[PDB]
């Protein structure tokens, strides 16, 4: 499959960088090995696949192996995003396994090392995320020099600068929204647009289009396609974060309410409750982002259901997915890319 | 001066990126403004100046303004290193001014925001350092495509990949050495070579040489030059970190011992004490990295001086600086670069 060919390019790149850095000792080599296990650990490779279909949409032939490596840089970049995300969220586990700060703090305590184990774990986690960022970037620099004409080089860099600027802005806007208790739907839609629409769908699509051809028409359509599908992805995640199966999602029931996320679903519930039951709106406003018992959480989830927020989210997802498919159907791109992107928009739900 | 022209290129670059990111709101704009304030806050511009003399050594003409912007990328990269360093060290101030995590925790309290102000400060500081890194790299990508021939592009990327790989390895090796109580002079020499020799002198020099010409002979000589002068810089800092006047250094008296650093000075003191005062060696071994009173610190400083570690460090600094100037005198480079590098090696030492 295409995800495996993209992943194999990344495995060979990481293996080469690791070997070339072996003179720095076995401790740094162990950190690189940790990065290999996290990045290559397995997944759908959603963002590199969006880059492929963006290339397929405006290209005739298949990309060179080095261009597949360019698409894989989005996977290495995502490791940077997730590792620093786990520090910002103070998450203990990811996919059932301990986060980086916990793995290195436990290593500190197993070795009977001195100083604070938790300080070492956070410091090592910062550096682990930093390494993924500089190496994901080094891929783009290396592939641009070796496999791309200078015009494709300039188009690729401008997408690469935007996607890293937008995911950093999205991260900061999110912690500001949670700290300031931003209630509005517009605030949550802004974060979802930067974090999910731009970072996961639109900009990956434009990376493959930029590497293939000078098609500003298609890049603008993919931005409109990603703005609808990306928000649909976020709302699905928000619904699952409140009402989903914990054994499936990996997070407890009502986790978003537990953690105090400022989702569109939450913002929509406060707005609907303002019109239907002001006392339910006051319950939501004073409970979100606080330490909630299991009973308080079940009550908040039911109130979100009672005022129609979940039903409103489901129709949002249906409408956005339908328009995104309509934008895809009438796009001046190869029909084979229209099939794979409708496939991917469904395989990724 | 040359530092001002380099700084002006960075200020104009940062102003452009800030304006182009204005659509992301006033909160993210305040983070970028804080980045401008920190990077442009003032300094020697030591690392961009090393890059200039590396260019001057093998070039005929002066660099174009865009190449000065390439040299300024080292200053933006240094903000990434310092911001994340302040998090790794849990430092509260830097040169008398609060660190990033403290500035953003104060913003959180000023706004009466929700959650932990210190957790917000650490998260914002992580993102701030991440932003400096991606924008420092966006400079290198932008200048390479627009102002450099493809061969110079490839030489510049190789140095850019090495300097960020080596400062990350030096950071991890340092926290591992402190946590594992690495006593050897070799371990401290390895960290000082990566953190100071490579990162501050050698690689910046090679960045300017790479941007100017294909001179493998000069790049290898600057590596030998930086390996001596860079360690001499660190040994001077280590002596000042233990014996320096707080009015001159700006740091407390005996700060390195208070902070528990694994310096060559401390490593050499343990080795010298093993020969002359074995019980003083045990006092050093069991006190470095612990909570020390002001009397314990004064006691350790006197022991370090008594066993001759301070005098050994002074002769190391003298020998390394003398050999570095001898390597500079016999280098196949322009004599004007030989003068500026001897002057630059003096203004810093
Ligand atoms: Mg680049």
Numbering used by the authors:
A (entry chain A), B (entry chain B): 0 to 348
What does the primary publication say about this deposited structure?
We report structures of the Mycobacterium tuberculosis isoprenyl diphosphate synthase Rv2173 in three forms: apo and two substrate-bound forms [isoprenyl diphosphate (IPP) and dimethylallyl diphosphate (DMAPP)]. The protein possesses a canonical all-α-helical trans-isoprenyl diphosphate synthase fold that is dimeric in each form. Two divalent-metal-binding aspartic acid-rich DDxxD motifs termed the FARM and SARM (first and second aspartic acid-rich DDxxD motifs) are important in all-E-prenyltransferase mechanisms. Rv2173 is a homodimer with a canonical class I diterpene synthase fold, with structural analysis identifying some conserved mechanistic features in C-terminal closure and supporting its annotation as a short-chain (C10–C15) product-length synthase.
The apo structure was solved with a dimer in the asymmetric unit in space group P21212, while both substrate-bound structures were solved in space group I222 with monomers in the asymmetric unit, generating dimers on the application of crystallographic symmetry. Consistent with most E-prenyltransferases, which exist as homodimers or heterodimers, Rv2173 is a dimer in the crystal structure, with this biological assembly supported by native mass spectrometry. All three structures are very similar (0.36–0.65 Å r.m.s.d. across all Cα atoms as calculated by SSM; Krissinel & Henrick, 2004), with the main variation being in the completeness of the C-terminus; the apo structure is missing the last four residues and the DMAPP-bound structure the last eight residues, while the IPP-bound structure has a complete C-terminus. It is these C-terminal residues in conjunction with the aforementioned lid helices that are likely to close the active site fully during the reaction cycle. There are some differences between the structures: the IPP-bound form shows IPP bound in the DMAPP/allylic substrate-binding site with three divalent metal ions bound around the IPP and the complete C-terminus closing around the active site, while the apo and DMAPP-bound forms are more open, with some of the C-terminal region disordered, supporting suggestions that the C-terminus is important in substrate entry/product exit. In no case is the IPP binding site occupied by IPP. Additionally, in all structures, and even in this most closed form, the basic residue Lys43, which is likely to be important for the binding of the PP group in the IPP site, is poorly ordered and this disorder may also influence variability in positioning of the metal ions.
